[PDB]
Design a protein around this ligand. Structure first.
Ligand SMILES: Nc1nc2c(ncn2[C@@H]2O[C@H](COP(=O)(O)OP(=O)(O)OP(=O)(O)O)[C@@H](O)[C@H]2O)c(=O)[nH]1
Ligand SMILES: [Mg+2]
Lengths: 49, 215, 457, 222, 155, 72
């Protein structure tokens, strides 16, 4: 879909991460709030039916 | 963005020998919240929902009649069962006195069930079982009635082996003869112990002694 | 609003509306009564699932939702009678089965609202009983939680209800531990600023069984040295002299490390050693807690005192300036002759159809798995898998599993045990390509270089 | 004036010396300084050589300036704005001349500027779209590539192309941080099959080689 | 890239990435350097220089392995003047790219001296004269006069 | 998986926005321990003497010799 609305940070300092597995969009949609800055108008989906 | 009954509730609180404090625990999705819901509709004909997973516990206190009619006040701590939220269980496990562990008839014992029997025995509570979701053996899995017996016996024996593993004293072994386990189907409105079923047998048919029968 | 309703059991007595009562917080011991804030009761409620039925009075034995005892208290509270004091104790605060091991840094978008965010954090620390929030000296706010879904719901409530600030959140990482693999072949001994007291101690590794016993409260030293001795000698052929030498347990009441005292000829200096044991154990536990490498807890190590040159009349000079002396002895031995890093593991149980077993296998391979067991379910068309997985690689493992198999499989995870991360934590000949994934020989190296960079400097 | 100026220091904390000259945006990085990792790769990189020791001592990385991209884009904009009284072949000659004048001037700063490549894709497809609009349709199947790129001898229009290359993409976050690499390949303009349309950049010769060539050619002629 | 305008390491880089992708192209490149040393006179000096910088790229890219020098016996009688120019451009590029310290260092260590033997003549004296004279002309004074000092100590 | 690659909308871009993955991507220690060896040499001797008598003199004799005869 078309995007809903449309500098420096420290957490993405590339010396201070450990990258074992790359985060990927499926995780970013499984857990909207843990994995995402500015999650707005997001519905929180989960089911282990 | 209960007029003549809450007084009765108060006197029940005042008796302090007609109340029971129980924690409703078990694994994930094994029947707790539906048990509680169908139960409050039995009494009152008067994040989570979208999640389909319960995150934080909820307490209910309600007045229930037994197989003799004597009302009791029941303290029921409905917990979440996701292994990540075991925190909530600990909370209930302090402020309550017994535990009703809900086990699935189709799956049996898994991670959280055994870990919760551990947490319950190490805090010296009472331990009861409801083998829930029994229709999943008749309608879903389609099992000859004797193999349904086999599966139920198996679940009870395994939970027995574990509760013996974490607790030294052979004070209690669970089997429905002692009145340790219900059989249930939360959604199909069926919950029964050998006691209750034999009393049903007696009340509708002749006068047979329901206690010696249930034995 | 912000307020809560405290929820609890009335063991003795009978609560009523307006009843003035005094709280007993979690730190309150009988001789520190500042912790007890004094307040009253606004309403009294009783509960059906989500219906609040307000009453005037409740006797002992029930549960109740009390209004007004919110602001003073955090996770646990013990309520006692206000202005009627006989004397009161507290019940030991809640003990949890699982260790909260996942870590998330939090910051606002514009620092102007740092106080508002702080309000928010307090509140959730209130609501979730296992949440462990701490503001780390590098200036950050770390949140310490159980699993990915747990922290998701935490931040859900953080952004939804308690504060409407916009918040940046780091990626999850885990909290580590420090340990050793062999004895300090030689010792560096620390001496007082005012050079009065010389402390010689080495380090060496314990075995896992007794450390876990330390954890399980099986070897509780609340016993006398006699019970300690029979325990140790009986079970693991420990020396009775090792028992007479064992002083205390370190990080706290429950600390998997041990402090040992073995130098017989100066041992009979109980005038001086029996004096200094207090500062000795304080420095021991400080050193164990504050970490030698990356500011994290140590475990599974045993320290031994082999020469205690005590200042005659170890007065206030000694007494005051010997605790850092002690912890530098600890660091000296530890860093001296075998640093090593330890990281947690996760237990994963996967239900799966019969066919997709191989599928989960492959996933666990990508993430350093070691699947242990795979077994039929009796009376079901399903197989159960039990496996381990480094909590590092546990991030998204569930959803990865379910996506690859069309929802058929499903896993839960629990913390189980720590383990040696396969790297050498202290090797300068190891340089880190700063964004691609390291191979195993350097995981520990990386693991420290990153964490200290944000904390240890 | 300080706002229209730019001062850039090189010390023991900045290893890079950046500047901005006639149309280029250059950044010099010596080997002595913090290049533990060094490559020799795509031609965006000049290798400066110390003329007495004859050893390569630094690398200059080139990019197109921002106002030069803007100037190219405004130039295409006025090709299009003043073209409703001209024929298809005149519009395409103006495009050809503009694009040659850019590519033969910059020539390896264009490889390294991932914002140019997108500018050139959109600008070439705007020219094509105005020619379609010239007929009375924009259907993508009435106008395969062959209609535009066929030389003027076989009756085509004769466009010169730089919009059928793939645009390299990599992970925005670190791409704004640390020059991470190239993992994905977004697509350029759309061709009717594989069709592999050739490229202007491959027929123009880089500077850093023309300067060595010239040195030797004039040396030996002298 | 033989047919190209002038050398751009584009084709070098591309063939090197293929070698990076499979070993088949690494042994292909062994045989290819063997082929071009066999067919080196078959070019002009233009093609000669571009292929020289080809293999020089290959070497200092670590794509071609330094063992390859076994194919280079620096005796006057067996050396094409065309091959002479080939190796001169090759080693001009090597020295002015990796720098003379690590080249002379890599030219020095024995672990590849078996192959380097054809390049550094010590047993037979006349081709030592010739080859030391050649690399001197190229301006590799260090290795040359070290080997000539070995020669001076020899009798 | 829109893994931070591609366009927000391939809409006015002259492209179909199709993304792909780059196929060509690949010394007291001994002396302190002798006093530790000596340590049980007094206790365990006085203990094994305590097993055959806790008169505190017969065990001090066995412990005194075990201290002098060992240090010799
Ligand atoms: N087949 C069958 N399913 C039942 C029955 N009773 C309850 N269920 C299930 O009950 C689920 C409803 O939520 P619950 O599982 O009760 O909630 P829960 O057990 O506490 O799990 P959590 O809330 O996450 O801790 C539905 O998904 C049904 O699958 C039953 O008697 N038969
Ligand atoms: Mg629920």
């Amino acid at each position: 879909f078309e995007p809903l609305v449309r500098d420096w940070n420290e957490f993405n300092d590339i010396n201070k991460i450990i990258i074992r597995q790359p985060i990927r969009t499926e995780y970013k949609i499984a857990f909207p709030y843990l994995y995402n800055n500015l999650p707005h108008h997001v519905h929180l989906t989960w089911y282990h039916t | 963005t209960t007029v003549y009954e809450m007084d009765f509730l108060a006197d029940l609180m005042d008796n302090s020998e007609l109340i029971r404090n129980v924690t409703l625990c078990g694994h994930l999705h094994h029947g707790k919240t539906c048990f509680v819901d169908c139960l409050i509709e039995q009494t009152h004909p008067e994040t989570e929902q979208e999640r389909g997973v319960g995150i934080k516990s909820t307490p209910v206190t309600v007045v229930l009649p037994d197989t003799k009619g004597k009302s009791y006040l029941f303290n029921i701590m409905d917990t979440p069962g996701h292994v990540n939220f075991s925190d909530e269980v600990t909370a209930g496990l302090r402020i309550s006195d017994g535990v009703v562990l809900f086990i699935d008839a189709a799956e049996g014992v898994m991670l959280n069930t055994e870990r919760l029997i551990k947490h319950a025995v190490q805090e010296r509570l009472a331990v009861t079982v409801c083998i829930n979701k029994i229709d999943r053996l008749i309608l879903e899995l389609k099992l000859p009635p004797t193999d349904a017996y086999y599966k139920l016996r198996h679940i009870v024996d395994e939970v027995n082996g574990l509760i013996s593993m974490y607790s030294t004293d052979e004070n209690l072994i669970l089997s429905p003869l002692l009145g340790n386990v219900c059989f249930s189907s939360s959604q199909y409105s069926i919950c029964f112990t050998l006691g209750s079923f034999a009393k049903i047998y007696a009340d509708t048919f002749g006068d047979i002694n329901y206690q010696e029968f249930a034995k | 609003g912000v307020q809560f309703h405290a929820f609890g059991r009335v063991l003795s007595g009978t609560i009523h509306a307006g009843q003035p009562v005094k709280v007993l917080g979690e730190n309150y011991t009988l001789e520190d009564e500042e912790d007890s804030q004094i307040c009253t009761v606004g309403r009294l409620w009783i509960s059906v699932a989500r219906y609040h039925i307000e009453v005037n009075r409740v006797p002992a034995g029930n549960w109740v939702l009390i209004e007004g005892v919110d602001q003073p208290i955090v996770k646990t509270a013990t309520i006692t009678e206000p202005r009627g004091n006989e004397e009161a104790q507290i019940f030991r605060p809640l003990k949890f089965n699982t260790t909260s091991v996942i870590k998330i840094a939090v910051e606002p978008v514009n620092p102007s609202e740092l106080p508002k965010m702080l309000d928010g954090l307090r509140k959730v620390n209130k609501s979730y009983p296992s949440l462990t929030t701490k503001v780390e000296e590098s200036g950050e706010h770390v949140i310490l939680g159980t699993g990915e879904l747990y922290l998701d719901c935490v931040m859900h409530d953080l952004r939804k209800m308690y504060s409407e600030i916009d918040i940046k959140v780091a990626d999850p990482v885990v909290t580590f531990c420090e340990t050793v693999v062999e004895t300090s072949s030689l010792k560096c001994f620390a001496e007082t600023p005012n050079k009065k007291n010389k402390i010689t101690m080495i380090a060496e590794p314990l075995e896992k069984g007794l450390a876990e016993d330390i954890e399980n409260e099986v070897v509780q030293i609340t016993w006398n040295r006699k019970k300690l001795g029979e325990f140790f000698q009986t079970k693991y052929d420990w020396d009775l002299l090792a028992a007479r030498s064992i002083w205390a347990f370190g990080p706290d009441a429950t600390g998997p490390n041990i402090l040992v005292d073995d130098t017989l000829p100066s041992e009979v200096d109980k005038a001086l050693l029996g004096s200094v044991k207090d500062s000795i154990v304080q420095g021991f536990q400080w050193g164990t807690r504050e970490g030698p490498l990356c500011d994290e807890l140590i475990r599974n190590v045993k320290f031994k005192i082999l020469d205690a040159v005590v200042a005659q009349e170890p007065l206030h000079r000694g007494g005051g300036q010997i605790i850092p002396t002690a912890r530098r002895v600890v660091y000296s031995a530890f860093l001296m002759a075998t640093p090593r890093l330890m990281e947690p593991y996760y237990f994963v149980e996967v239900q799966a159809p019969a066919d997709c077993v191989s599928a989960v296998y492959t996933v666990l391979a990508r993430r350093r798995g070691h699947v242990t067991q795979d077994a039929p379910i009796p009376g079901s068309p399903l197989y159960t898998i039990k496996a381990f997985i480094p909590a590092i690689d546990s991030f998204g493992f569930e959803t990865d599993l379910r996506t690859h198999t069309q929802g058929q499989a499903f896993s839960l995870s629990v913390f189980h045990h720590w383990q040696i991360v396969p790297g050498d934590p202290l090797d300068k000949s190891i340089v880190i390509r700063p964004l691609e994934p390291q191979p195993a020989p350097h995981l520990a190296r990386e693991f420290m270089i990153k964490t200290r960079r944000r904390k240890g400097l | 004036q300080w706002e229209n100026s730019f001062v850039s220091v090189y010390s023991k904390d900045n290893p890079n010396l950046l500047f901005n000259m006639c149309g280029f945006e250059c950044r010099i990085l010596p080997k002595c300084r913090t290049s533990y990792e060094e490559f020799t790769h795509k031609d965006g990189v000049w290798n400066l050589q110390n003329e007495v020791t004859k050893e390569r001592t630094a690398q200059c990385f080139l990019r197109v300036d921002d106002e030069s991209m803007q100037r190219f884009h405004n130039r295409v904009r006025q090709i299009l704005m003043a073209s409703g009284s001209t024929t298809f072949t005149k519009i395409v000659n103006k495009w050809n001349t503009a694009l040659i004048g850019l590519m033969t001037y910059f020539r390896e700063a264009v490889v390294n500027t991932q914002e140019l490549l997108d500018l050139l894709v959109k600008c070439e497809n705007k020219i094509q779209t105005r020619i379609k609009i010239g007929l009375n349709s924009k259907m993508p199947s009435r106008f395969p590539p062959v209609v535009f790129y066929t030389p003027k001898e076989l009756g085509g229009l004769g466009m010169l192309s730089m919009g059928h290359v793939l645009i390299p993409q990599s992970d925005l976050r670190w791409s704004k941080q640390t020059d991470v690499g190239i993992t994905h390949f977004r697509s350029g303009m759309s061709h009717e099959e594989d069709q592999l349309i050739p490229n202007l950049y491959r027929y123009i010769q880089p500077w850093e080689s023309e300067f060595i060539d010239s040195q030797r050619v004039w040396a030996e002629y002298a | 890239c033989a047919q190209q305008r002038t050398y751009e390491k584009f084709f070098g880089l591309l063939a090197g990435r293929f070698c990076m992708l499979k070993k088949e192209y690494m042994e292909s490149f062994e045989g290819i350097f063997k082929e071009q040393y066999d067919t080196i006179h078959r070019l002009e000096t233009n093609k000669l220089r571009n292929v020289a910088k080809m293999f020089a790229h290959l070497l200092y890219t670590d794509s071609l392995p330094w063992s390859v020098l076994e194919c280079i016996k620096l005796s006057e009688e067996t050396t094409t003047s065309s091959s002479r120019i080939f190796v001169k451009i090759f080693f001009q590029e090597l020295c002015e790219y990796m720098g003379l310290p690590k080249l002379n260092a890599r030219l020095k260590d024995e672990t590849l001296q078996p192959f380097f033997e054809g390049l550094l003549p010590r047993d037979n004296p006349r081709n030592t004269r010739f080859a030391i004279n050649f690399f001197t002309s190229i301006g590799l004074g260090g290795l040359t006069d070290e080997l000539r000092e070995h020669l001076k100590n020899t009798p | 998986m829109y893994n931070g690659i591609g366009l927000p909308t391939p809409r006015g871009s002259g492209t179909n926005g199709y993304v792909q993955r780059n196929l060509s991507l690949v010394p007291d220690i001994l002396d302190h321990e002798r006093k530790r060896r000596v340590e049980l040499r007094c206790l365990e001797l006085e203990e094994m003497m305590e097993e055959q008598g806790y008169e505190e003199q017969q065990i001090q004799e066995k412990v005194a010799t075990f201290r002098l005869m060992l240090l010799e």
